[PDB]
Amino acid sequence: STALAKPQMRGLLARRLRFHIVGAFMVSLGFATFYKFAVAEKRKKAYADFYRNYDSMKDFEEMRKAGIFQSAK
Amino acid sequence: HYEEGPGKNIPFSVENKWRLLAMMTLFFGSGFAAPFFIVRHQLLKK
Amino acid sequence: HQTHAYHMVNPSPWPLTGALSALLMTSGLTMWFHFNSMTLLMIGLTTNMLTMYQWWRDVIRESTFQGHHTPAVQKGLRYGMILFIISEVLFFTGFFWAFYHSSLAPTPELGGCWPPTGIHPLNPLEVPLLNTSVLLASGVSITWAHHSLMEGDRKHMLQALFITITLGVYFTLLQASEYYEAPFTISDGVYGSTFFVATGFHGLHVIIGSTFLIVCFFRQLKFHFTSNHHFGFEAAAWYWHFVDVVWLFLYVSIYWWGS
Amino acid sequence: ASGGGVPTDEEQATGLEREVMLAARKGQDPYNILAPKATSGTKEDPNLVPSITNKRIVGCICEEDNSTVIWFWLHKGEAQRCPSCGTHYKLVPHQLAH
Amino acid sequence: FENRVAEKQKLFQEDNGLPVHLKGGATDNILYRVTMTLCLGGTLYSLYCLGWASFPHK
Amino acid sequence: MFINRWLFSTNHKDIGTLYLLFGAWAGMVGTALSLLIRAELGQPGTLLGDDQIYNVVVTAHAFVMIFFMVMPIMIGGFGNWLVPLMIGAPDMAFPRMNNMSFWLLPPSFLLLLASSMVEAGAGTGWTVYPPLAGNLAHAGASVDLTIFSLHLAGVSSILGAINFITTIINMKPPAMSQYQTPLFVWSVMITAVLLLLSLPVLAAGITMLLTDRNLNTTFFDPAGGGDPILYQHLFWFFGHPEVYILILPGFGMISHIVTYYSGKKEPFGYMGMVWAMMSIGFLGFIVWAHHMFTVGMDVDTRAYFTSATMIIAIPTGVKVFSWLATLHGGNIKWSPAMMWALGFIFLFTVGGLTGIVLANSSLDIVLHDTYYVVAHFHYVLSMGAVFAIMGGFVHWFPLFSGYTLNDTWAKIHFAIMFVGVNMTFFPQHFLGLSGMPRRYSDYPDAYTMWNTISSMGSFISLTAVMLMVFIIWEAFASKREVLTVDLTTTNLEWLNGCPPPYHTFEEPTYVNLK
Amino acid sequence: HETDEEFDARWVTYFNKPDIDAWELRKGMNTLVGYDLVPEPKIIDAALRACRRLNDFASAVRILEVVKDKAGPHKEIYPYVIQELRPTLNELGISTPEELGLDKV
Amino acid sequence: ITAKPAKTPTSPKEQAIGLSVTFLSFLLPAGWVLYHLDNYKKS
Amino acid sequence: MAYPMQLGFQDATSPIMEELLHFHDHTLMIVFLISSLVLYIISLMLTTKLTHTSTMDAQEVETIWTILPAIILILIALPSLRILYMMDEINNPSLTVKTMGHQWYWSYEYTDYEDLSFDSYMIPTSELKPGELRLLEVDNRVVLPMEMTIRMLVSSEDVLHSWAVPSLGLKTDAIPGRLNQTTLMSSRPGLYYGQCSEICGSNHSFMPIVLELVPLKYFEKWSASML
Amino acid sequence: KIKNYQTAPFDSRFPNQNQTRNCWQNYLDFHRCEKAMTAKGGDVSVCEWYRRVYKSLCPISWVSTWDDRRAEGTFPGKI
Amino acid sequence: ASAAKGDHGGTGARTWRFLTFGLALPSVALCTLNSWLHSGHRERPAFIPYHHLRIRTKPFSWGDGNHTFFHNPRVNPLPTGYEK
Amino acid sequence: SVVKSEDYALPSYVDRRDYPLPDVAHVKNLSASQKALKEKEKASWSSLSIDEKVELYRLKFKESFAEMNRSTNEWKTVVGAAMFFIGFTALLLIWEKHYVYGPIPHTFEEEWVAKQTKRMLDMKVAPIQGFSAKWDYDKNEWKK
Amino acid sequence: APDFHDKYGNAVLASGATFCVAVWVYMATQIGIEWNPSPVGRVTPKEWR
Ligand code: HEA
Ligand SMILES: CCCCC/C=C/C/C=C\C/C=C/C/C=C\CCCC(=O)O[C@H](COC(=O)CCCCCCCCCCCCCCCCC)COP(=O)(O)OCCN
Ligand SMILES: CCCCC/C=C/C/C=C\C/C=C\C/C=C\CCCC(=O)O[C@H](COC(=O)CCCCCCCCCCCCCCCCC)COP(=O)(O)OCCN
């Protein structure tokens, strides 16, 4: 036989809201970070790596040899 | 002056559920079937 | 029995006859344009006239004869008229927009200039100026009509209203002769197109406005208007000022600036 | 310059238009054109709500500028209270036509 | 002209249960039937015209 | 009796009921047309073997859904039944003109069906751009019949808009200001001001098209000094307000449904919701040329239309967050109407956010005239309007009929519809980003996968529509009559009973000024 | 607005009014459960005594049910409140919903 | 909302009939046109 | 061209297309955020028995949810407008090619020096050579020199059409009586496909665009041989 | 002769997307020039720059239509 | 502006009639003179078959299909020139 | 007990978590014993039995909080039935495939596709990320 | 007293799911639909010229 303490009784809904809006925000910043990493930076690097030593005459000659052009056999 | 109340404020009868079924079938059914028939008509024209 | 002041209207056939008349006139114009026949059109024009005649007859019955136009009813009618005229102003606006678009940037087909090569505009100082003085005058004589009616003066109401309608009719005959005399037609490129379709919708409104004033003339003759309750006359005066203002914009834009 | 010949509303208004005009001249409002002014709304001084029947819908705007209107049937008999603010209303039935 | 508004008012307020569009008497009924016959007749004619125009007249 | 009541009506409730029947019937037509579209596209190759017929189907699908299903239901249907009730008015201001707005619609629909039956149809797009819609590329009566159909539907909505404005301004209780009318009445008033101003501009532009086709005018024909682009400005100057016209009464109903099933007496931020609908209405007249970014437009005009277009998201998001804030702390009731309103909030957000991608004229150069645009508007507009209409319809069916629906069947229907519409339109984003044009009867083989899924989704929504019909049959077949409805104290339209009598507010409400 | 203490004190006074009628009792409880809080024991104690003065046993039990409901998933609140009220419950002969079998579905 | 029990209850069997009839009214006519589309195209 | 199951844009062929992909990535991040934040806040509102149904004060939370959106739109508009104006910047083309829309095929005119013009029609499916692309191939391709600034001018001789090549970020409507300009620069050789992008009637779906990008010297001999 | 033309350069009088007036102005200039020359006893070759520019810009069908209309007496611009 | 006159005590019937006869109808009589003076037929210009004028993309739905609705033989040439 | 439609304009009884004290008692007519119970209730509640307390509750109110808030198995019927109609949709799609659609173009045949795929690699379709980027031009196979 | 859901709930759920998965699997794999999946990792490129 012990008494129960007095729990918080006031502003329960507002407390739940405060708590989770902060979590909603953090999901967003830790996701922003992810999207910026798996998609956006991945793209800049794909393009940058592709073009760094890209040789367009060499690319053309391989296409020309493959027979793909009307204007160049 | 007019009938008032559930089932009386409408241009169609709901006195019998089967007659109602038939009418609703024709009413929504004609709307739905019309574009198929218009396309059939235009195909058959040439 | 109601204890508000609003009007509950007797069930009426005119909405349906008006709707069918719109279908006949549109079907009709189609038949005329494509199947060389005027029959549908003639029928929808006839039923349309009959619908307007009876529907407005009934409004006169409901008001002068039966007393349903309380202040609250009359106030709604004043909103409805104003809204109506707004919608007509937006309608002319799309024709003004067409005019300015084509005249501000004339394409090479026209000669690259406005008026186009080969178009000889009317002199805006001849019959168009006359038309302008006619419509402006009729806005002064209708305001005299309006004050006479409010001052209780029947004879001067009828006289000023008569002068107003004679000026509308003079405008319409002057315009019909201008149309006949013009060396350019509706088929003369976008100059003809914009000229005729804009001034032509304006002329139709002058005919409608004139008809509305003639309706008010006959009702006045029949003593329907009181010195304080005469919404039909107000509405026709508002619509009349609308037709005058549209003319002033046509005059300044098409006849003067576009010349 | 002038003359007469144009009827007045006093002469020629008829039906409900005439009725409203005649009542207005007596300061009365049988067609509900004006908004009623509130009493203090207590038990002892309730808002008095005329009706030609034994119930009438009341809309209570509890505080000035509320956008929410509180709606309820007021029935003949004891004063009722607005379920949002408690202000008191009492129905006062019957007549309008002699 | 004389003001015969009061007569018209007496006629259109007569307690006979008639709708306003028919309350002027027998002529209203005629004009009504002419209007409605032309409208319903013209509409059936437009349906006829549609049927005819729906097919090539080669 | 029948003819007096139903052909000669001067009653707002019965004319609202006729609009709902008319709009439900149009809906079955526009639905069949959309399933013909998706069947053509459901596998690579040709189904109809006739691409003029495909283009006529696409065109009719849009005009029917927009002019005959959505506008009649929202404004004629819910606006007639609910607006006079919600302000305690005895009817519309012009109850007899109201009946002609209704009856103009069957003739306008008949003209539309006539244009598809004569010649080869109008295969123009619902935008009806010349010269394709002119008398050389579309010779004969079909496009004129379409134009006349629009003229009648235009007259019907313009006289409707005059009726609603006047009714809402002039017929409230003497004590009720404008800032005391429910948000649905605000949404109808704003919609009507836009109808009033925009439809006469369409009427002027399609009239010019009619005279170019039949009186040798050359407004849009460069051989007479005309310009096809001028028609596009006239059309979109109406067409943008038109899109807000189609959704604003939906936002009005949404606000009432969210408030009601949250157990709340009022929406959150009422004056913010008013402000948002007014700002959207105002700004809806200055963004139209974002429909024309590939026409050959100067750059500064492009920068301005991109920016004015973005600014509209601001008032639109206030409304989304205010619906969330209305739900917040609610005693949430999971009725079928609440599910429709929640599905609305989610679909509308998705579609408004692809709108934001599109606002960027530089990205729109590549997305314009592709399925990315079809995906935008079937989310924000199409499903947004349909979900609000289904929400409103389930919520207020017992009010209009005096009978209840089966809530379980109605939950089932929502669920099927939500899967169908997402399976139909989500894949079209992929099709549009990868470059599939819109208005196509067939596609390069790479696009097969998403087309196939999209066409299959379309049949799932068919099944939901057939179920909807049976659900409405079941309610009228069983006749469970309504006894009690909660929250009448802040939902005046329910307070005269279910259904309410033919004449309500014969004695007006009593409201004190104080 | 006001402190928690002033809010609670105003509610206490509301329900302590000796001649509170049945209408006021309902208006006060139905307004109060709109707030984001479970009412302090001293507010519920005043409402319960108002039930006594109005000879309404059933409403006292209903008041206990709605306290429990206002706590949502905070299962510690209701047992604490009942603990705090137990002298008043004893004094007035009010059985709890659980003692009545009225917590069973 | 509360309501009375149905005045004319519609049993599971009657539901099954109203539902089948409703689905057939949409399916058969369109099914018939689509099934014969070849016949239209070359005719 | 697009490939099976593609989710996003075709890979960029020009620096301007590449810019647009990075700008779409920025935008769609934001789009994702917002939509997720929303779906989420919503499920939050809907998953508690706790209630609070009395009047709530709005003018405060309205600040956040008007200002935050305005900020976000500015974070989209800034790079949006920079791209818009960058693409509008003067560039000095070495070549102008006209294309004219027709029902249903494209004609091309290269008249800086000689009168070279020809018509470009879709290859019918039954005439495709093995390994060619249904609806995409043409008899005569638009040969152009790679790595050079080209001015395209676009018009029509009948109804509207629209000349599009998604991998280059290009779409310019083809309007009769009007001459619309766009510039094109391919960083690579190869074959680049688009499709008519304004509804122009029965065969809107079947008048594609195929660009053939090769070294200048091959373009010049191809030109000479097409006279 | 101060030439060496690849294509028509940027013309700040016609900087935007619609190049119709660029084409038309050059077509006019060329023919105005050729008229001023072939009249007053001089050389059409001073007109060559406008000829090159309108040829580069203008659709063949426009040039062709405008040439027919000058022959017919129905060309609406002032030369 | 304030025009160049006076009255303004009240704007009544007498004032508006004074304006109708003293200002408005006299303007109309002045304009009618200035018109029925500059009227008399002007010399019709040489016919040139400009392709932006006399448009015919569809026959008009009256007459022989080639005459405008208010065709004036004197001053409206057909696509092939003025009539006989 | 019995509620009537023609009572719509009168305060009514409701069970709602958020409106605990509704505007009228659930039972308003009392039998002789129910009237003696209401009398008894004017005296100390300690002298009421448990049964009598319950009976007083059930006179004032229809359902308890626990009764009115109980969860249900309805979701199973909703999710099962929706999957049933979705499954039924597949049957329409099987029918449409069997009777409406003919053969799709020859460009989807396996050998056509292999040749097209080589050509797309030869022309280096989407060489940065989308397509050819995924082919190994050295090892002559798809990147693992 | 058990309602419709208590009595049929479990069976509606189970067979609804079973039925839906079976028929969509059949439609997807057994009747000749060409989904046109990526060749990547699945098609061996073949000489076309
Ligand atoms: C319901 C009708 C509706 C609505 C509401 C919208 C809303 C918007 N539309 Fe759309 N739109 C169409 C119907 C609609 N549209 C139609 C039918 C078409 C094409 C028609 C055709 O060609 O046939 C179309 C086409 C269209 C185009 C032309 C694409 C093209 O053809 O190339 C463009 C581009 O600017 C556009 C942009 C937008 C935007 C920015 C909104 C906004 O008003 C959306 C704003 C809403 C949100 C953004 C979600 C809510 C907000 C938040 C959660 C707050 C915070 C948000 C941010 C900070 C971004 N739309
Ligand atoms: C092809 C041609 C076609 C023309 C088209 C027609 C349209 C016009 C319409 C109709 C106009 C008809 C006029 C009616 C005339 C008589 C109405 C009878 C009423 C009357 O007699 O009004 C009198 C004035 O009338 C009057 O001079 C009437 C005077 C008319 C004035 C106009 C004439 C111009 C006068 C020349 C002077 C010009 C110099 C002007 C310089 C200054 C201007 C700024 C005032 O008298 P009273 O004592 O106050 O009356 C009390 C009870 N009636
Ligand atoms: C006398 C001045 C007042 C003008 C009224 C004149 C009467 C003729 C008929 C009614 C016209 C009124 C509406 C305006 C419509 C278009 C053209 C009207 C202007 C006009 O009358 O133009 C005439 C051409 O008429 C033509 O083609 C006429 C072709 C007549 C058929 C008109 C076609 C009607 C189609 C209109 C559909 C309107 C849709 C509007 C809907 C409202 C929005 C819902 C000009 O004659 P012209 O020989 O070319 O040139 C003169 C050279 N001597």
Ligand SMILES: CCCCCC/C=C\CCCCCCCCCC(=O)O[C@H](COC(=O)CCCCCCCCCCCCCCC)COP(=O)(O)OC[C@@H](O)CO
């Ligand atoms: C050859 C001619 C054919 C042309 C076709 C169309 C032409 C004719 C239309 C001309 C308009 C006639 C309108 C007459 C309306 C008479 C009814 C009337 O005027 O009704 C009044 C109410 O106003 C009311 O409804 C006001 C109602 C306003 C209607 C005005 C509408 C203008 C109509 C335009 C229609 C075409 C639109 C434009 C097309 C591009 C009655 O109230 P009071 O006057 O206060 O009287 C009561 C007092 O007596 C009591 O003491």
Ligand SMILES: CCCCCCCCCCO[C@@H]1OC(CO)[C@@H](O[C@H]2O[C@H](CO)[C@@H](O)[C@H](O)[C@@H]2O)[C@@H](O)[C@H]1O
């Ligand atoms: C876009 C939405 C469309 C949804 C898909 C509709 C799917 C279910 C449709 C069922 O419809 C029918 O089925 C037939 C066969 O299954 C048809 O009979 C045809 O087939 C026969 C046998 O193959 C013959 O017995 C007949 O004479 C006959 O014409 C045909 O009439 C039709 O009504």
Ligand SMILES: [C-]#N
């Ligand atoms: C946006 N339309």
Ligand code: CUA
């Ligand atoms: Cu050419 Cu579409």
Ligand SMILES: [Cu+2]
């Ligand atoms: Cu828009």
Ligand SMILES: [Mg+2]
């Ligand atoms: Mg386009």
Ligand code: NA
């Ligand atoms: Na196809």
Ligand SMILES: [Zn+2]
């Ligand atoms: Zn109150």
